[PDB]
């Protein structure tokens with residue numbers, strides 16, 4: 325019948341908060357999930373949410389007629405900077421559907437074919453960097469993947485060159501971002517520099533570059549493109565929010581993906597061997613064609629399996645549109661919040677079998693077999709990732725070229741250490757790459 329909701333122990337007015345005293349809250353919540361099962365309530369001073377981990381409950385939560393996207397505490401801080409951009413707007417905010425309609429054509433297959441050459445530009449810069457390292461040198465994986473993904477969104481979206489590969493520290497734009505992503509995550513564990521405004525020069529420079537300057541990219545649609553429903557273009561204030569949104573969303577999760585993918589490949593030599601052999605076979609030309617990337621079937625499986633284990637945007641939040649009952653057992657009142665613990669969803673033994681921790685790309689051999697709402701690294705419904713096909717094309721292309729051009733060594737026997745900034749990264753992951761001395765075009 326009507327069930328009492330599991331909940332970890334509460335400590336007076338502190339509630340459950342002393343159980344999340346960590347820089348790694350998602351990983352801590354995964355342990356609580358292992359303990360309490362498919363749903364638990366979590367209270368902190370003043371606020372309450374319910375963590376879901378099973379495909380059966382999340383499939384219900386994914387019913388857009390009953391639950392909509394909620395801005396979690398973390399997203400409410402990002403909203404200070406990203407405003408009512410796509411990622412930090414409520415669905416019922418006018419600018420949400422408006423920008424969605426305006427910007428969606430920028431991710432059509434075709435706009436995607438139109439991005440490929442610029443993707444290859446940044447990818448060649450990555451490969452050339454690693455070709456040019458001396459014998460005594462190693463690669464800082466997440467740091468270089470971030471150089472690539474930031475430059476890729478810069479160039480494809482905004483025809484702006486961040487020139488991240490001409491810098492040996494992260495781009496100044498990144499360095500701001502990283503501090504605000506962590507401080508928003510830390511502000512949650514507070515029961516009782518963040519203001520220091522840096523990226524607005526960058527935004528000005530992106531718009532001004534375009535002002536001067538034959539482009540048909542994301543920025544063009546932001547600037548000119550009007551919403552078929554209402555006839556309205558985006559206003560200036562919202563355009564600035566969208567630029568910021570796409571610069572942060574357009575690079576951070578993709579970089580984490582590539583990093584985890586390389587991690588899992590160097591830990592699984594037989595998977596690496598097969599992935600490498602596909603890359604050599606398919607990529608027969610000096611630089612990859614759009615069509616060839618689509619032929620990298622096993623590399624795509626490798627990426628989906630990295631997202632299964634460590635989805636780089638690991639949670640999303642929902643709220644009950646009306647009073648409702650969840651799972652036929654848990655009554656919810658209007659406004660009650662739910663969080664989808666994606667890494668936990670992706671370990672549901674009832675869906676995946678009981679080797680959920682193993683890195684097996686062949687799970688994705690025939691994807692239509694995978695139940696609905698079992699695999700959700702890109703979110704849900706109308707508020708799902710708009711950039712999904714962009715991210716996967718970029719990553720497939722890049723991983724393909726890496727595997728074609730180098731042999732990789734896990735030279736420090738790296739121990740996985742996952743840093744959380746509301747995206748996930750394998751912090752400190754380093755490798756050595758031995759060139760196969762295949763020329764570029």
Ligand code: HEM
Pocket residue numbers: 393410411412424477569570573574575577578581635636637639640641700701702703704706707708709710711712714715716
């Ligand atoms: C593997 C890489 C990526 C992952 C795992 C990922 C994941 C996600 C997830 C889980 C959401 C839903 C957020 C929520 O429900 O609160 C989302 C939304 C969003 N993502 Fe992605 N993302 C990736 C790459 C990208 C890229 C490359 C772009 C842009 C080029 C992008 C742009 C966006 C935008 C604008 C939204 C808000 C969409 C809306 O609500 O209308 N993402 N993403």
